Design a protein around this ligand. Structure first.
Ligand SMILES: CCCCCCCCCCCCO[C@@H]1O[C@H](CO)[C@@H](O[C@H]2O[C@H](CO)[C@@H](O)[C@H](O)[C@H]2O)[C@H](O)[C@H]1O
Ligand SMILES: CCCCCCCCCCCCO[C@@H]1O[C@H](CO)[C@@H](O[C@H]2O[C@H](CO)[C@@H](O)[C@H](O)[C@H]2O)[C@H](O)[C@H]1O
Ligand SMILES: CCCCCCCCCCCCO[C@@H]1O[C@H](CO)[C@@H](O[C@H]2O[C@H](CO)[C@@H](O)[C@H](O)[C@H]2O)[C@H](O)[C@H]1O
Ligand SMILES: CCCCCCCCCCCCO[C@@H]1O[C@H](CO)[C@@H](O[C@H]2O[C@H](CO)[C@@H](O)[C@H](O)[C@H]2O)[C@H](O)[C@H]1O
Ligand SMILES: CCCCCCCCCCCCO[C@@H]1O[C@H](CO)[C@@H](O[C@H]2O[C@H](CO)[C@@H](O)[C@H](O)[C@H]2O)[C@H](O)[C@H]1O
Ligand SMILES: CCCCCCCCCCCCO[C@@H]1O[C@H](CO)[C@@H](O[C@H]2O[C@H](CO)[C@@H](O)[C@H](O)[C@H]2O)[C@H](O)[C@H]1O
Ligand SMILES: CCCCCCCCCCCCO[C@@H]1O[C@H](CO)[C@@H](O[C@H]2O[C@H](CO)[C@@H](O)[C@H](O)[C@H]2O)[C@H](O)[C@H]1O
Ligand SMILES: CCCCCCCCCCCCO[C@@H]1O[C@H](CO)[C@@H](O[C@H]2O[C@H](CO)[C@@H](O)[C@H](O)[C@H]2O)[C@H](O)[C@H]1O
Ligand SMILES: CCCCCCCCCCCCO[C@@H]1O[C@H](CO)[C@@H](O[C@H]2O[C@H](CO)[C@@H](O)[C@H](O)[C@H]2O)[C@H](O)[C@H]1O
Ligand SMILES: Cc1cc2nc3c(=O)[nH]c(=O)nc-3n(C[C@H](O)[C@H](O)[C@H](O)COP(=O)(O)O)c2cc1C
Ligand SMILES: Cc1cc2nc3c(=O)[nH]c(=O)nc-3n(C[C@H](O)[C@H](O)[C@H](O)CO)c2cc1C
Ligand code: SF4
Ligand code: SF4
Ligand code: SF4
Ligand code: SF4
Ligand code: FES
Lengths: 197, 213, 71, 349, 476, 189, 113
């Protein structure tokens, strides 16, 4: 008809109503699956630093929230086998070259590092991209170290008089990563009991 | 013949190569051939469905509010597509990110919806949408392949994790033991490749005209 | 303000001259100086016209007229 | 066909201009080559020869006369890129830089006089982005014939092929050192008191690019070019004055965080960019106010990205940005005509 | 006053020292002269004589058809043999309407109409006396002097400027004409100062003519308001628009005449011609030309009758000592390539340079490198590179925006171009295209108006006749 | 502060060179400078208004009612309506003004930038002031890039580009080199 | 539900507003487009007998003359429209291309760089 303005309003309203009904049906169909996919992605990210055998309970169910004096507030995820803490997984951030670096640590119940992975970074590709575990084994250096067998003199790059290698032509990013790891270990040492066990 | 539109839309009137449309997804999601193929497939679906809907609803659209009506008919569909590929193709959805949602404003989609779907039956509109989507997918695959070869050497990488293990046969390697030129992946490498492709298209068109003469 | 034209096929001449209002074709031609351009002009023998109409030497002319001398 | 005037000329030529620019660059290039040794010579020769060959090939493809190869517009680009590179760089760095400049930056736009961007700086930016490791490895000064620099065949192995430079032959320069030590919570004064000498940095006794090191022979060449009327003093004067003024103000405000004046001037390719690279005629304004604006913008951008940026030096980026801005400057700052006001209306008298 | 400084300009090799040594020579009467009927600007004069008539030296062969024109006088006594086509001093080589006079050789003057006490009559009388003398402004612009003087009278003139700053290379006609006839030029300047009621005359000579300056200062030292000025040695200095700025300090407004700033400019030869016409009644019959170049045996200055073939001038100066690579009618910066040596000498001919190969630069055009040496050399403050870019792309409308309107074709562009580009050639082509479009539009407007008027008058005549016939039959 | 935020939006995070948003009209109209300026002003105003309206719609209607997935639709629909009004209101009120903003307004009804900016701003959780500033900064970056590119292409139109590259391809290559030039501002803010 | 009603209200508001605005007050590719030899007559000396047909059929005042054996001739105002070609019974009009003369001479474009 395309005449009086009533047709325009009625047509737009009908279109919006039908589209909204379809969209809400699709959402009620797929929101649970989307949430499941996101949870599975989180578990897959966690599984790269925490082996299956160490933990029995669901790590993403008993999240702590601890306030320290330096880092602020943390997100310590425990890994209890039988009512006993065996590993704590948390995240650290520290300024790199192109911005803050956000990484994950998986310190066991005795202080031994079970694996460190870098989550978010904006370092220069081809010069400081070796922090990623998919390109280099450098990030796999921290795998047996602790605050016991490594005093507060080797927790630095070789440029600053430590024991950790630095990338050829890039030292700031390894400095930041090692500082984050050391701060995480010291933070675990400070908060006893709950985090230490 | 209805098949004429499907063949003619591939090269004579290319969405991203002749009409100068759909440049944002052409330049953005094209660092890998797999990303280009996925984006092209999604866009082709959306185009087919939207063309069918618009043509079936052709004699009802008020001429003065044609855009916000048809845009809606697009937008909802696009939304559904998002809520589909975020739920069962999450690996690909994480890669494309924003540009899967940015199909509503895709100039090719609205251009084909308005120009051809408002004066043609359902079958010709569906065929035209399929042809435009196929041409867009081919252009995306070509650009992504060139950029990926220049950047890493490999062609079609991690297709198994993105498009399913059934496509594992597509992971081919060119120039083994190659660190690659980093600039191809970066934004400056997209405009240059697109310009070179346009120049090559012009040259081959002139040569084909000369041969036909 | 009128013009004088010599339709000589060898050399078509056209000149523009300002004359006093109420003048005559004879005085207009004399003032225009076409006689000194071509000494072979006989004003008593050759045909004198205005816009293609044979006229008289002392016939009054209005502004915008075109006196023409031809065979 | 008739010939048109005028039938007089002042015997000028592009060949003479380009060769005089190369002659002005000659002393600094010699000083750089002697200081760094054979690898610098290898890289410089490779860059220049590859630039000439690629220019010849591109001229052949487009059908342009081969005499265009003789005006020196390609040798100059190769020379500037070679003296802009690190000394002990591999051959493929220079070859790729020459290909990316002569090619995309210059010949793809038609040839000399048609490109809108500086070719040498375009290639420098592309190389720095694509290969950051090879473009951030600075070799210490190992003078030619000094019993410590590598021999001839050792230098061949260093440049061609991939022989590692061993240890103790690579150090940090000045700007990057200052930025890193600032990231090491050390104030800007202690870093410069024990890690920078103005007298030796002015002569060119510090690590850096091939010809960038000496800020004195470059000054001599630039002054000679100015006297020969090949370039205009507006761009160099504006760039240097802007950088010096901003650096001095920053030093006077917060002396414990900013270093300015002599340190900023005698470090990086600031003088080379000011005299020889920002003064490219094809990509610089043709007016006087236009050239002043170009120079001021270049200096401001250089200082801003030097201090608060993520790069130790941004001469190339500033030059490229101002090359992008040039056409608006040309079309909005045209010189006043004769008998007309600035708006172009006829004068009234 | 005090000399200002103009903007732009070049210093080409003068080459004036090889010809400005010998005094002004003389020419034997050639057998036949070719006088084009259009030796001026504006409309072409109409012949008054027929074939076979006998004319005397000074008879008015052709008369002006309108206000802006100039007559043509017989240079010598003889018989007219043709009123037809004659070769023209043009680069094209096309012919033009003109008379051919067979020189009798007697060289008998006609009964001239001399004046009496020229400093007694009103300026209009002197202006029309100059009008009936053929004075055409022997400066290059060949604009009739009577029209310029009449336009000068209506405004207020505060200074009469004599353009004695001969600036073209190889040319020395003004130098000798001022060395030898300074008194006549001063008298002509006084006559012009009387015609245009003015304040003072400021005769200007370049500083590379010390002899001319000394002679002029010796000649004009008792008359008061007369002044002699020594302008700098710059090429585009003899131009009226630049000389006015150098002397007064003002600038002539764009699209305006020199009378706006109250200054009139006249050449040093035009002033002498005006003095001759006013004092003695002699029309413009002969002028002074300069024969120079490496291919001429003896460069010199010759008192040439108008209409003399170029070959006679070349033969007079010894002859061509070699092969002339180029023949130019004027200075090398604004000359025109002569087609042949049978071309006559019009009132606007300034020189006949015979340039060899080692005086002509070799040129190999190359793409513009935007060195901006054109902008620093243009006297009018334009941007030649942009004008060339727009003219090469046939965008004349955009070219006019960058200064193609104000260009004077002085040649300073191509003189300082590293990559040798025919900038002046581009500008001439663009101006020719613009003039052709303008002429086509003018013709279209004229023909449309003529059609409108003719149709309207025919229709009204037919309607009146029909009404009269209808009235006649009604009474029948 | 907000000046640093605006400068970072304009230079460091340019909506075209590093965002790939609104490239079709950007490449289609930048052949001439005057249409480029007109479209720049129009798109800046449109992006600011669209950002404000989208923030209001999201934080006052969608989130309180619980429907967030609808946003895309709602967003574009509202924007479309606004544009139409901003066209017709300026096609009878000020006919002279329908030569600098009205003519180019239909080009940006669906631009991918007027929609990309609100969706990006939603993920950052901006407030109303930050949303409006983000829209205005993106519009200013688009305007500046378009004007510079228009100047470059206008100069290239009179150059001796090879016949196999004259036109769009040389524009794409120039845009790539311009993005390379702008890459130096990375990390500054 | 409470959401479909709100969306329908927004839609009807937009539709009514657009309709009222239309009462009171394509494609992207096409929208971008919107934003962005003479001859002269000739009369010989024999083929004209003064039949005055050429002047009779000539909207321009090109032919001048009347009567008989007068040899009417054209002017510069001719445009080659041919209104006099068929007019002449003896076929006197001899339309020809315009010849090159000195006053109609223009400089030639330089060859190339
Ligand atoms: C056209 C003229 C423009 C003039 C521009 C003048 C403004 C720029 C200087 C003032 C801003 C200085 O900016 C200051 O420096 C650092 C880098 O040194 C910026 O950048 C920093 O933060 C950002 C974001 O986390 C990351 O890139 C990284 O962590 C670091 O580079 C910061 O955002 C700011 O603290
Ligand atoms: C004017 C410029 C002239 C250019 C002249 C080029 C001459 C040299 C040819 C290029 C180098 C060929 O040398 C190359 O060496 C490498 C290892 O060193 C080996 O090649 C290997 O690595 C290269 C690295 O890009 C790749 O091709 C590939 O991964 C593999 O083939 C081959 O041996 C040979 O491909
Ligand atoms: C895998 C290769 C893909 C190439 C992709 C990039 C496109 C390059 C092709 C177009 C390049 C233009 O570069 C060059 O342009 C000139 C225009 O003078 C064309 O023309 C040139 O060569 C032809 C012969 O083929 C001559 O007849 C002509 O006189 C000459 O100009 C060339 O054929 C082309 O090589
Ligand atoms: C003009 C041709 C092209 C010039 C540009 C390309 C030049 C490239 C040079 C190739 C160098 C190959 O790499 C270099 O090879 C030379 C032989 O030449 C080896 O040199 C070897 O032979 C020489 C004698 O000839 C011995 O003295 C030396 O001790 C031994 O090492 C080097 O150890 C190796 O570093
Ligand atoms: C315009 C100038 C062009 C500059 C070109 C420079 C090319 C330099 C090439 C050097 C050789 C390539 O690098 C080298 O490759 C080969 C393997 O392929 C090996 O080198 C070996 O073979 C090459 C030839 O193939 C010999 O010249 C060399 O003396 C020998 O050591 C080394 O493993 C690697 O160092
Ligand atoms: C981005 C603008 C410039 C574009 C430049 C054009 C591309 C130039 C080649 C880039 C290749 C990058 O990849 C580079 O390949 C070269 C071979 O060339 C490898 O080089 C390897 O082989 C060469 C010989 O061929 C040896 O001399 C060298 O010691 C060895 O490492 C490098 O280890 C790798 O870093
Ligand atoms: C034609 C132009 C002039 C051509 C000049 C040619 C000669 C130039 C030679 C200069 C290079 C040698 O000059 C100098 O040598 C010494 C070795 O003693 C190098 O290195 C040494 O001196 C520097 C100077 O502070 C100190 O860090 C240290 O004592 C040592 O490293 C210098 O970095 C270099 O500057
Ligand atoms: C506009 C053209 C260029 C002008 C010149 C540019 C010079 C370089 C910029 C200078 C900027 C200094 O930057 C500014 O320094 C002041 C110093 O007062 C710092 O201020 C800091 O120290 C001062 C004392 O000095 C304290 O009182 C203050 O509380 C503290 O914040 C600011 O945190 C910083 O923002
Ligand atoms: C270059 C052409 C333009 C010239 C413009 C000149 C305008 C400014 C003139 C006043 C400059 C004052 O310049 C002042 O000089 C001192 C030493 O005297 C310099 O200071 C210098 O020595 C101090 C220690 O003494 C060092 O820490 C510092 O790094 C070094 O630059 C600074 O650069 C500035 O603080
Ligand atoms: C490029 C150029 C060169 C000129 N060269 C001279 C010259 O050499 N001598 C001169 O007297 N006038 C020269 N003029 C000025 C005119 O030729 C002429 O003198 C002035 O316009 C009026 O003088 P006239 O009326 O006496 O001809 C030149 C003008 C221009 C534009
Ligand atoms: C004074 C001067 C400076 C120049 N600077 C450069 C430069 O920085 N980079 C370059 O590639 N060519 C440079 N050239 C060479 C020439 O300008 C270059 O070939 C044009 O950019 C080619 O388009 C310069 C030439 C001169 C005369
Ligand atoms: S003189 Fe020649 S090369 Fe220099 S700017 Fe002018 S036209 Fe270009
Ligand atoms: S010819 Fe025209 S543009 Fe060139 S210098 Fe002379 S006045 Fe200026
Ligand atoms: S129509 Fe022919 S015959 Fe008659 S007057 Fe005209 S030219 Fe003469
Ligand atoms: S062609 Fe037309 S305009 Fe020309 S003379 Fe004939 S009728 Fe007149
Ligand atoms: S502007 Fe983004 S698809 Fe056209």
């Amino acid at each position: 008809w395309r005449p009086m303005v009533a047709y325009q309003g009625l047509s737009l309203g009908l279109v919006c109503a039908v589209v909204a009904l379809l969209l809400l049906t699709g959402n009620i169909m797929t929101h649970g699956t989307i949430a499941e996919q996101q949870m599975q992605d989180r578990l897959a990210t966690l599984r790269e630093v925490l082996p299956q055998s160490l933990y029995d309970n669901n790590p993403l169910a008993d999240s702590f929230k601890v306030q320290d004096a330096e880092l602020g507030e943390v997100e310590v995820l425990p890994a209890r086998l039988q009512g006993k803490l065996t590993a704590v997984v948390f995240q650290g951030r520290n300024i790199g070259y192109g911005g803050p670096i956000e990484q994950m640590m998986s310190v066991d119940a005795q202080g031994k590092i079970l694996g460190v992975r870098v989550l978010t970074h904006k370092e220069t590709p081809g010069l400081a991209d070796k922090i990623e575990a998919s390109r280099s084994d450098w990030i796999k250096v921290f795998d047996g170290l602790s605050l016991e067998n490594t005093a507060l003199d080797k927790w630095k790059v070789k440029k600053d008089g430590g024991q950790f290698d630095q990338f050829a032509g890039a030292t700031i990013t390894p400095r930041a990563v090692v500082k984050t790891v050391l701060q995480g270990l010291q933070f675990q040492a400070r908060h006893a009991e709950q985090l230490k066990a | 013949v209805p098949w004429q539109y499907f063949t003619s839309a591939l090269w004579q009137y290319n969405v991203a190569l002749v009409q100068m449309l759909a440049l944002c997804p052409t330049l953005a999601v094209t660092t890998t051939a797999t990303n280009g193929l996925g984006m092209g497939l999604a866009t082709t679906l959306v185009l087919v469905m939207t063309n069918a809907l618009i043509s079936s609803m052709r004699h009802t659209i008020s001429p003065e509010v044609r855009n916000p009506v048809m845009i809606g008919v697009i937008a909802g569909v696009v939304t559904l597509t998002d809520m589909a590929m975020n739920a069962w193709m999450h690996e690909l959805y994480k890669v494309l990110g924003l540009f899967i949602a940015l199909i509503v404003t895709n100039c090719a989609v609205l251009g084909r919806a308005e120009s051809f779907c408002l004066r043609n039956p359902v079958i010709p509109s569906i065929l035209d949408g399929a042809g435009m989507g196929a041409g867009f997918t081919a252009v995306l695959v070509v650009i992504g392949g060139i950029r990926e070869i220049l950047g890493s050497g490999t062609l079609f990488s991690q297709a198994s994790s993105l498009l399913g293990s059934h496509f594992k046969w597509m992971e081919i390697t060119v120039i083994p033991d190659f660190q690659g030129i980093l600039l191809a992946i970066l934004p400056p490498g997209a405009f240059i490749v697109l310009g070179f492709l346009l120049a090559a298209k012009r040259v081959i068109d002139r040569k084909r005209a000369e041969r036909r003469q | 303000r009128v013009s004088v034209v010599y339709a000589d096929p060898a050399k078509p001449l056209q000149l523009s001259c300002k004359v006093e209002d109420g003048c005559s074709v004879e005085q207009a031609i004399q003032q225009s100086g076409v006689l000194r351009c071509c000494p072979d002009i006989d004003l008593k023998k050759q045909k004198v016209g205005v816009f293609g109409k044979f006229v008289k030497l002392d016939s009054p002319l209005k502004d915008g007229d075109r006196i023409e001398i031809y065979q | 066909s008739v010939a048109a005037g005028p039938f007089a000329h002042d015997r000028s030529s592009v060949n003479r201009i380009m060769l005089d620019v190369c002659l002005a660059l000659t002393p600094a290039t010699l000083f750089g080559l002697v200081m760094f040794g054979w690898p610098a010579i290898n890289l410089w020769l490779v860059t220049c020869v590859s630039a000439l060959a690629i220019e010849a090939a591109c001229l052949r493809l487009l059908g342009q006369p081969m005499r265009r190869l003789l005006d020196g517009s390609a040798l100059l680009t190769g020379w500037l890129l070679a003296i802009s590179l690190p000394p002990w760089a591999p051959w493929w760095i220079g070859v790729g830089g020459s290909l990316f400049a002569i090619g995309i930056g210059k010949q793809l736009y038609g040839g000399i006089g048609q490109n809108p961007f500086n070719p040498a700086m375009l290639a420098r930016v592309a190389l720095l982005i694509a290969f950051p490791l090879q473009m951030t490895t600075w070799a210490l000064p190992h003078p030619l014939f000094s019993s410590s620099a590598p021999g001839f065949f050792d230098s061949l192995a260093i440049t061609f092929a991939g022989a590692p430079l061993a240890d103790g032959m690579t150090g940090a320069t000045a700007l990057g050192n200052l930025k890193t030590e600032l990231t090491l919570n050390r104030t800007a004064q202690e870093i410069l008191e024990g890690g920078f000498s103005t007298i030796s940095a002015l002569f060119g006794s510090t690590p850096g690019s091939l010809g960038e090191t000496s800020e004195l022979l470059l000054l001599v060449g630039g002054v000679w070019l100015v006297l020969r009327r090949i370039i205009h003093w507006e761009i160099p004067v504006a760039i240097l004055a802007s950088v010096f003024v901003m650096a001095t103000l920053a030093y006077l405000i917060n002396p414990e965080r900013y270093a300015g004046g002599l340190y900023q001037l005698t470090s990086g390719g600031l003088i080379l960019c000011a005299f020889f690279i920002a003064t490219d005629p094809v990509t610089s304004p043709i007016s006087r106010v236009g050239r002043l604006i170009f120079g001021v913008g270049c200096g401001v951008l250089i200082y801003v990205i030097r201090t608060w940026g993520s790069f130790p030096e941004a001469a190339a980026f500033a030059v490229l940005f101002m090359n992008a801005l040039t056409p608006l400057i040309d079309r909005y700052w045209r010189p006043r005509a004769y008998g007309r006001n600035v708006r172009g209306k006829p004068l009234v008298a | 006053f005090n000399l200002s400084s103009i903007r732009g300009g070049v210093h080409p090799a003068a080459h004036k020292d090889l010809s400005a040594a010998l005094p002004i020579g003389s020419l034997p009467l050639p057998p036949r002269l070719y006088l084009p009927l259009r030796q001026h600007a504006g409309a072409e004069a109409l012949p008054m004589v027929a074939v076979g008539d006998k004319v005397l030296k000074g008879q008015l062969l052709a008369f002006p058809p309108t206000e802006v024109s100039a007559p043509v006088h017989a240079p010598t006594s003889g018989r007219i043999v043709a009123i037809g086509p004659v070769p023209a001093p043009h680069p094209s080589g096309l012919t033009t309407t003109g008379i051919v006079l067979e020189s009798d050789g007697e060289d008998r003057w006609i009964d001239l109409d001399v004046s009496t006490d020229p400093f007694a009559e009103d300026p209009l009388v002197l202006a029309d006396r100059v009008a009936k003398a053929g004075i055409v402004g022997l400066g290059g612009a060949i604009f009739p002097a009577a029209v310029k003087l009449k336009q000068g009278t209506r405004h207020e003139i505060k200074t009469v400027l004599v353009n004695g700053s001969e600036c073209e290379p190889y040319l020395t006609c003004d130098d000798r004409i001022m060395r030898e006839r300074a008194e006549a030029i001063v008298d002509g300047a006084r006559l012009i100062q009387h015609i245009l009621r003015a304040y003072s005359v400021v005769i200007a000579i370049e500083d590379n003519k010390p002899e001319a300056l000394a002679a002029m200062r010796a000649a004009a030292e008792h008359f008061g308001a007369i002044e002699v000025m020594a302008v700098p040695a710059l090429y585009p200095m003899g131009s009226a628009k630049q000389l006015i700025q150098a002397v007064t300090g003002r600038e002539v407004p764009a699209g305006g005449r020199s009378t706006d700033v109250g200054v009139l400019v006249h050449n040093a030869g035009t002033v002498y011609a005006i003095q001759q016409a006013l004092r003695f009644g002699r029309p413009l019959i002969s002028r002074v030309v300069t024969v120079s170049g490496a291919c001429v045996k003896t460069p010199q200055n010759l008192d040439v009758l108008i209409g003399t073939p170029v070959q006679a001038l070349i033969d007079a100066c010894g002859g061509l000592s070699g092969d002339p690579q180029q023949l130019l009618l004027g200075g090398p910066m604004m000359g025109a390539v002569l087609p042949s040596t049978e071309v006559p000498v019009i009132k606007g001919a300034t020189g006949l340079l015979a340039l060899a190969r080692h005086e002509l630069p070799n040129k190999d055009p190359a793409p513009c490198i935007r060195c901006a040496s054109c902008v620093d050399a243009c006297p009018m403050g334009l941007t030649p590179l942009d004008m060339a870019l727009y003219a090469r792309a046939d965008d004349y409308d955009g070219a006019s925006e960058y200064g193609l309107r104000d260009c004077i074709l002085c040649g300073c562009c191509s003189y300082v171009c590293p990559s040798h580009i025919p900038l002046v050639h581009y500008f001439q082509y663009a101006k020719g295209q613009q003039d052709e479009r303008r002429s086509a539009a003018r013709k279209s407007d004229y023909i449309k108006r003529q059609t409108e008027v003719r149709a309207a008058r025919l229709a009204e005549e037919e309607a009146a006749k029909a009404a009269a016939k209808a009235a006649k039959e009604a009474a029948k | 502060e907000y000046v640093l935020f605006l400068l970072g939006t304009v230079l460091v995070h340019n909506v075209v060179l590093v965002g790939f948003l609104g490239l079709c009209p950007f490449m289609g109209v930048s052949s001439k400078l005057d249409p480029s300026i007109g479209l720049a002003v129009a798109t800046t105003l449109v992006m600011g208004l669209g950002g404000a309206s989208s923030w209001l719609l999201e934080h006052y209607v969608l989130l309180p009612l619980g429907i967030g997935f609808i946003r895309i639709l709602a967003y574009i629909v509202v924007i479309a309506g606004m544009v139409q009004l901003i066209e017709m209101i300026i096609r009878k009120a000020s006919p002279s003004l329908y030569r600098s903003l009205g003519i180019y307004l239909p080009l940006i009804t669906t631009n991918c930038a007027v929609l990309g900016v609100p969706l990006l701003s939603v993920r950052e959780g901006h407030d109303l002031t930050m949303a409006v500033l983000f829209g205005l900064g993106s519009g200013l970056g688009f305007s500046l890039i378009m004007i510079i590119f228009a100047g470059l292409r206008e100069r290239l139109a009179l150059a001796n580009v090879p016949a196999a590259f004259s036109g769009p391809p040389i524009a794409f290559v120039t845009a790539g080199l311009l993005a390379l030039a702008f890459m130096g501002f990375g990390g500054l803010i | 539900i409470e959401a479909t009603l709100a969306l329908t209200v927004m839609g009807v508001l937009l539709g009514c507003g657009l309709g009222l605005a239309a009462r009171k007050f394509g494609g992207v590719g096409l929208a971008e487009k919107l934003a962005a030899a003479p001859m002269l007559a000739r009369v010989e000396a024999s083929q004209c007998i003064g039949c005055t047909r050429c002047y009779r059929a000539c909207p321009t005042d090109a032919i001048v003359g009347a009567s008989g054996q007068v040899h009417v001739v054209l002017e510069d105002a001719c445009t080659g429209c041919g209104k006099c070609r068929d007019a002449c019974p003896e076929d006197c009009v001899l339309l020809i291309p315009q010849e090159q003369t000195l006053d109609t001479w223009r400089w030639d474009k330089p060859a190339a760089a």
